[PDB]
C-alpha cells in the first residue's frame, strides 16, 4: 500500500548517578520491528518482528553500533542543552528524536522528516524541502548554524531519500504476509440502558490493522456529535487495534441511529444499527 518507516528515540538524564536512560524503537507502518533499551541485558539492537530475524550478523552488529552512537549523541546533547538553557545539574531532562520516510503505493519516495525535542517541546526540525531547518528558539538557532556549517541536512537528505526508502522496500517484501495485509475491523453494537427512558449505544471496531480508522454516528442520515463519546484508538496487544464510539438516545428511538466505519481494509464503509 502506502507505507512508512520511522524510528523513535528517548533519552532521560539521571542526575543522581550514572548515564541517561535510552530507549529506541523502529516501526514499519504500525508494526514495531526493532528495539534498544539501555536498561536491558543484551546491550544490542533486538528483533521484535519475525520478518526481521532473518537479517544476518552484519545487520545486528551495525545497527547495535549505530544505535549506541545515537545514545551517546543524546548524552552529549543533554549536557549541551542544560548549558544553553542555563539549567542546574540537579534536575532530570528529556531529549526526543523521530525520523523516517514515507513511500507511495508504487514504493516511490513521498516525503522525509527529522524532528528533535527538548523537555517535550519543539527544538529543531528538518523542513519538508530536506534542505532547511526550523529552529524554535535562539538555542535551537545556534544548533541550526552548527548543522548548516557541517552539511548535516545534505547527508540526512541522502539517507531519507535513499537508504531509508531502500530498506523500507526490503522490509515490506520480507514481511509481506503481514505488512501488506489489511485486517478490516470486526464490528458490533452493544446497548446499555441508563434509565427507563434512555440508553447508550456503543459501536465497536476490533482487531483491525493498520490503526487509522474513522467512526461516526448519524441520526436520520445526518451526522451527530451531540451526546457522543469517541475513545482514542488503542492497541489490542496482538498487533491489532481497537476503538469505539457511543451515543445516548431516547429509548425506543434506536433505529434512527447508525454507526459508520471507514478503514483501508474496507472497500466500502460499513453501516451498523441496533436491533
Amino acid at each position: 500500500g502506502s507505507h512508512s518507516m520511522r524510528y523513535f528515540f528517548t533519552s532521560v538524564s539521571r542526575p543522581g548517578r550514572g548515564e541517561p536512560r535510552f530507549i529506541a524503537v523502529g516501526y514499519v507502518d504500525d508494526t514495531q520491528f526493532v528495539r534498544f533499551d539501555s536498561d536491558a541485558a543484551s546491550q544490542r539492537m533486538e528483533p521484535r518482528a519475525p520478518w526481521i530475524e532473518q537479517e544476518g550478523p552484519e545487520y545486528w552488529d551495525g545497527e547495535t553500533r549505530k544505535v549506541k552512537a545515537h545514545s551517546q549523541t543524546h548524552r552529549v546533547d543533554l549536557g549541551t542543552l542544560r548549558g544553553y538553557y542555563n539549567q542546574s545539574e540537579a534536575g532530570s531532562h528529556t531529549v526526543q528524536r523521530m525520523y523516517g520516510c514515507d513511500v507511495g503505493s508504487d514504493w516511490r519516495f513521498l516525503r522525509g522528516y527529522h524532528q528533535y525535542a527538548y523537555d517535550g517541546k519543539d527544538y529543531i526540525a528538518l523542513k519538508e524541502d530536506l534542505r532547511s531547518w526550523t529552529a524554535a528558539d535562539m538555542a535551537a538557532q545556534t544548533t541550526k548554524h552548527k548543522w548548516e556549517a557541517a552539511h548535516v541536512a545534505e547527508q540526512l537528505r541522502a539517507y531519507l531519500e535513499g537508504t531509508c526508502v531502500e530498506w523500507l522496500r526490503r522490509y515490506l517484501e520480507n514481511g509481506k504476509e503481514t505488512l501488506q495485509r489489511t485486517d478490516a475491523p470486526k464490528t458490533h453494537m452493544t446497548h446499555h440502558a441508563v434509565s427507563d427512558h434512555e440508553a447508550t449505544l456503543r459501536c465497536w471496531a476490533l482487531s483491525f490493522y493498520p490503526a487509522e480508522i474513522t467512526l461516526t454516528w448519524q441520526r436520520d442520515g445526518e451526522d451527530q456529535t451531540q451526546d457522543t463519546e469517541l475513545v482514542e484508538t488503542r492497541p489490542a496487544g496482538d498487533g491489532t487495534f481497537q476503538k469505539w464510539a457511543a451515543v445516548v438516545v431516547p429509548s425506543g428511538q434506536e433505529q434512527r441511529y447508525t454507526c459508520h466505519v471507514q478503514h483501508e481494509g474496507l472497500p466500502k464503509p460499513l453501516t451498523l444499527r441496533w436491533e
Binding site: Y7, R97, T143, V152
Partner: peptide, 9 residues
C-alpha cells in the same frame, strides 16, 4: 536501517 550520522546539537 538506522541513519549513520546524527550530529550533536
Amino acid at each position: 536501517l538506522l541513519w549513520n550520522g546524527p550530529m550533536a546539537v
